[PDB]
Amino acid sequence: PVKVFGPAMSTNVARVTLCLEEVGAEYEVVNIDFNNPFGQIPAFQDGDLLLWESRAISKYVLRKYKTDEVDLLRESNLEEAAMVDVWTEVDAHTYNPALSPIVYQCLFNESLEKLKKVLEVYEARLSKHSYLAGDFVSFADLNHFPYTFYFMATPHAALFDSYPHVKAWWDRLMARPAVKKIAATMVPPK
Amino acid sequence: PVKVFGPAMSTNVARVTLCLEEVGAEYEVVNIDFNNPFGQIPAFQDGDLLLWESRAISKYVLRKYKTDEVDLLRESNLEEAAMVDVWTEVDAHTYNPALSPIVYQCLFNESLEKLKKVLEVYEARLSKHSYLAGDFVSFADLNHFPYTFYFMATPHAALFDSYPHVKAWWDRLMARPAVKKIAATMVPPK
């Protein structure tokens, strides 16, 4: 059984726990307090192996537990793997940064016009394909879950109704058993 | 022959051209002017395939042209691939951002104390291993080339002399024939 160290509700921990659930790995989430050379969270233990960097942890999980039924990187198919990589990068560089300040300014404390231009592109893409990388769910889709989840707790949630293919894609991810399981974990400690 | 569209000297184009040279692919670099749905540069054509996102382009290049002698992702070995991923992410999230404002404030126009703390970590890592992911060159090392190249044009270049293992690792990358070739291309158009 592998161990994830960090807060359950953080977007970087939820990205790893979502990957562990999609592949059906046995794992434990452990809270750690600061009181792994850059001392980052999440950290990840598998036997003597210690990893950090949410995306590197996630890919290790998706490769280690890969099957014919759950192949979420598609590394056996050059062009599928490329489309998974492209939309993973779009999530990191374009999408998550368009969401982030709406989430932060709405749940604590102009970005709407930039997000709409991004959703136009997603709407075109999800009109031609079931999921971002093609006609199969992949890491690219799962990477969109944690930030969109919090965006859907804001008063801007309904913005997705103007992008019917994006709304349908979002609802489809939200129906996945692994996504429902990780949604329920994304709460402050009790 | 594949085509890379963008400025030769940009860090994101040089990352792709360095990968194409390390695998010995036939390619052409094409300048494009704005006068690929988010219209990003570099863009990449391989037959009917059009890609964007420097890192996704790079990985497609490293997989398409992979051999026994030039395996720069190590996707066949779970833990090696994980260490390549970890240090690729360290480059994106920690290293390149520590260099960037030193490069920008020195060649145009506090970050030194943060860079030193990062170089301490790199020095420890490169004391135990030849290269960042283990005893083999990988994408993780190549990702460090473009920004470090520009950092070495600043008056802070000599900072690496305080980190002898980092200096030796840097000199070793600079001696690679592919790196020398791409260093020479990183000039303004003539």
Residue numbers in the entry:
A (entry chain AAA), B (entry chain AAA): 3 to 37, 50 to 123, 138 to 218
The publication says:
In black-grass, upregulation of a phi (F)-class GST1 (AmGSTF1) has been shown to be a functional biomarker of MHR. Recombinant AmGSTF1 has been shown to exhibit both glutathione-S-transferase activity toward xenobiotics, as well as acting as a GPOX, reducing fatty-acid hydroperoxides to less reactive monohydroxy derivatives. Each protomer has two distinct domains; the N-terminal domain adopts the typical thioredoxin-fold, with the C-terminal domain being a bundle of at least five helices as demonstrated by the crystal structures of AmGSTF1 presented here.
All polypeptide chains adopted virtually identical overall structures, with rmsds ranging from 0.2–0.4 Å on Cα-atoms.
